[PDB]
Amino acid sequence: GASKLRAVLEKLKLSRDDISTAAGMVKGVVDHLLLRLKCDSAFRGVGLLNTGSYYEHVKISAPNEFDVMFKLEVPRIQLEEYSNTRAYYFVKFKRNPKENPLSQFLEGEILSASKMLSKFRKIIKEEINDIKDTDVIMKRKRGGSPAVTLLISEKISVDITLALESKSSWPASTQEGLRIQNWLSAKVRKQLRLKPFYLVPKHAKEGNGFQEETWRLSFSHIEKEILNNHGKSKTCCENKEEKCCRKDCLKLMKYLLEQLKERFKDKKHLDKFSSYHVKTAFFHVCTQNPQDSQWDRKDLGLCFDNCVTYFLQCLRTEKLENYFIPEFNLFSSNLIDKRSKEFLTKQIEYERNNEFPVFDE
Ligand SMILES: CCCc1cc(=O)n2nc(NCc3cc(-c4ccncc4)ccc3Cl)nc2[nH]1
Ligand SMILES: [Zn+2]
């Protein structure tokens, strides 16, 4: 229970404090790459997404695996939804009397993620080789991923993702999403929806089996802003008497899935689940339990159980709405077959019934 879950959280804290030297190395490589990329005519306006914060850790049990997002603003973007999939869009340009450098990535009237990533990757590979103050290598592209992956010092890996930034209003598919009014208030929802949105290249293994040049909506800056300002109280987690366990529960949900994917990495059944699914379910639980008193630190075990049982319910009913785009069902059988969700249900039920053996040291 709570005492065991606390021990888990404490062990993961230890490894995070150690990797600050690794973060220093990552930041040094990323800053060199941005300086070089900004010299290119097509990537002139590239920059860090979450400029203050280099890097996230997608995988909490892999402290030496870093994730960084670059953003590239494209003004006057014209988006064309793909086959009413709600999440995937062709990117087109508006009126064309002025041509600009990004047109070198056009395929017809459509902005090609392939072409853009090819030049992106080529510049990084060149510049990585021209670095000599630290040993960094570029890893070969895996069949699906659009990310550029660097390996630093034999054990630090960095996934770099290039996102397009649009400063216009969010696409209409988001209009009924981000249902935070009863938790964080309607005016915070309005404020958040005034920020830009992002488009990222999709995986090859992602989508309808074609290699169409569609882009996927991305709201990772919104996820980050909410987690850093997450209470109903404006002073949640800013004093002794207002320490909640929201972030802890999310960490534990991520770690649960990571451990189970590892325990079963021989089989194929868990390959389609990722932190994305656990994060989505967590945010729904925050919507469902908006009071800070529902997240008291003393109740860590009960709050974590709440997150687990909600996730189990989503698996069993095969319904998990995207937090921003409610019509997109992460758990549709078009995306994950029923037997895979049934298998994960079985494993999470086993863990819950046995006080989570997959956690203990
Ligand atoms: C705060 C809740 C978690 C969250 C963070 C975030 O950054 N985003 N970004 C979107 N964009 C919409 C979208 C994304 C994907 C997707 C497919 C594959 N790998 C990732 C994402 C599939 C369908 C849809 Cl509709 N959703 C989210 N949720
Ligand atoms: Zn808090």
Side-chain angles (χ1 to χ4, degrees):
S3 168
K4 171 168 185 165
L5 301 172
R6 188 79 62 196
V8 167
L9 292 164
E10 220 48 37
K11 178 194 173 171
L12 307 168
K13 281 223 180 213
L14 289 183
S15 52
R16 200 204 257 212
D17 283 54
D18 296 338
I19 54 93
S20 291
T21 86
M25 283 181 267
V26 170
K27 165 161 161 68
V29 168
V30 163
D31 284 343
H32 183 91
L33 288 183
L34 264 348
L35 274 187
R36 169 73 177 74
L37 257 352
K38 289 183 172 112
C39 293
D40 185 275
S41 61
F43 297 113
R44 251 193 38 165
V46 75
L48 275 176
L49 185 52
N50 307 294
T51 325
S53 141
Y54 303 58
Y55 86 77
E56 314 285 349
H57 290 273
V58 180
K59 186 169 174 168
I60 71 100
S61 57
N64 292 316
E65 296 179 8
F66 295 73
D67 212 273
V68 340
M69 185 155 314
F70 296 174
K71 72 177 195 76
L72 181 69
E73 196 188 339
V74 189
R76 266 208 175 178
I77 254 186
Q78 193 171 317
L79 293 190
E80 179 191 328
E81 183 185 359
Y82 174 70
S83 181
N84 102 126
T85 61
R86 292 304 183 259
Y88 298 96
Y89 293 81
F90 294 111
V91 169
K92 296 208 272 267
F93 291 148
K94 298 247 186 66
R95 299 187 173 177
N96 64 78
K98 261 80 170 304
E99 191 159 352
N100 75 70
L102 280 187
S103 81
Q104 69 192 259
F105 302 141
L106 285 187
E107 184 63 19
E109 262 224 20
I110 255 145
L111 192 68
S112 165
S114 295
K115 285 183 181 182
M116 179 180 300
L117 288 181
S118 163
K119 194 191 199 192
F120 188 70
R121 186 182 296 274
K122 192 145 36 212
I123 294 164
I124 292 177
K125 196 181 309 142
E126 283 183 314
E127 200 51 36
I128 254 59
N129 297 15
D130 251 301
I131 298 176
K132 330 286 176 52
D133 47 295
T134 179
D135 54 330
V136 48
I137 294 165
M138 207 196 85
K139 195 194 159 319
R140 177 122 150 245
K141 190 207 311 164
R142 299 212 145 150
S145 196
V148 179
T149 297
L150 311 176
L151 178 41
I152 298 166
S153 301
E154 187 160 24
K155 270 213 177 47
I156 301 94
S157 72
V158 191
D159 295 334
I160 300 166
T161 286
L162 183 56
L164 314 180
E165 176 183 65
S166 185
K167 272 164 184 170
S168 10
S169 308
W170 292 12
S173 60
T174 71
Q175 197 181 346
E176 302 303 316
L178 192 57
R179 246 182 277 91
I180 63 178
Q181 297 89 338
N182 265 73
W183 167 24
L184 304 170
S185 81
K187 58 201 170 310
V188 162
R189 187 185 182 265
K190 280 196 247 311
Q191 285 164 4
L192 290 177
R193 288 175 43 86
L194 291 172
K195 297 169 183 300
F197 65 96
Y198 297 87
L199 292 147
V200 297
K202 54 165 199 312
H203 272 65
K205 298 190 173 188
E206 185 183 351
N208 51 190
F210 220 90
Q211 274 183 348
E212 65 255 337
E213 299 286 346
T214 57
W215 304 69
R216 191 184 74 233
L217 294 168
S218 169
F219 299 96
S220 70
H221 58 315
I222 304 301
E223 167 196 318
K224 176 170 199 83
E225 185 156 342
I226 290 181
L227 285 165
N228 292 335
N229 192 11
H230 61 248
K232 178 164 298 293
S233 174
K234 298 165 187 178
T235 57
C236 191
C237 291
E238 299 178 17
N239 56 81
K240 301 191 204 182
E241 301 177 339
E242 291 196 75
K243 258 297 170 152
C244 85
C245 63
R246 283 183 183 90
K247 281 182 166 168
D248 283 346
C249 286
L250 173 61
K251 286 198 179 61
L252 292 167
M253 288 294 292
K254 288 179 182 184
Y255 189 50
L256 175 59
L257 179 63
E258 294 170 20
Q259 290 290 88
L260 285 174
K261 287 165 70 60
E262 184 67 24
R263 185 177 263 175
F264 298 108
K265 70 174 171 189
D266 301 334
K267 299 178 179 184
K268 179 74 192 161
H269 302 104
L270 298 193
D271 295 21
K272 294 188 172 181
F273 303 99
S274 70
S275 60
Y276 167 51
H277 300 97
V278 145
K279 285 186 291 159
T280 301
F282 173 79
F283 273 77
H284 286 308
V285 178
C286 290
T287 292
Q288 164 191 288
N289 295 349
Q291 313 294 331
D292 298 343
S293 64
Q294 294 178 286
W295 297 94
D296 192 304
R297 179 193 195 202
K298 307 180 184 181
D299 293 331
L300 174 64
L302 299 174
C303 301
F304 179 58
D305 194 74
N306 285 345
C307 293
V308 171
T309 56
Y310 180 87
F311 191 77
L312 285 170
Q313 181 210 18
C314 294
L315 287 165
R316 290 186 197 107
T317 65
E318 302 185 80
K319 292 186 169 198
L320 175 61
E321 295 173 12
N322 181 273
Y323 202 66
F324 302 88
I325 298 171
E327 311 169 67
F328 193 103
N329 182 12
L330 308 197
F331 281 177
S332 174
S333 44
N334 286 325
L335 299 176
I336 308 178
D337 67 353
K338 180 164 188 54
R339 174 173 194 173
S340 288
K341 290 166 292 202
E342 290 178 333
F343 180 80
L344 181 54
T345 301
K346 178 182 189 166
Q347 300 307 318
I348 290 179
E349 282 173 342
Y350 173 87
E351 293 297 321
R352 178 178 189 248
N353 295 344
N354 289 284
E355 292 298 285
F356 302 90
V358 91
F359 279 162
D360 47 48
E361 246 221 312

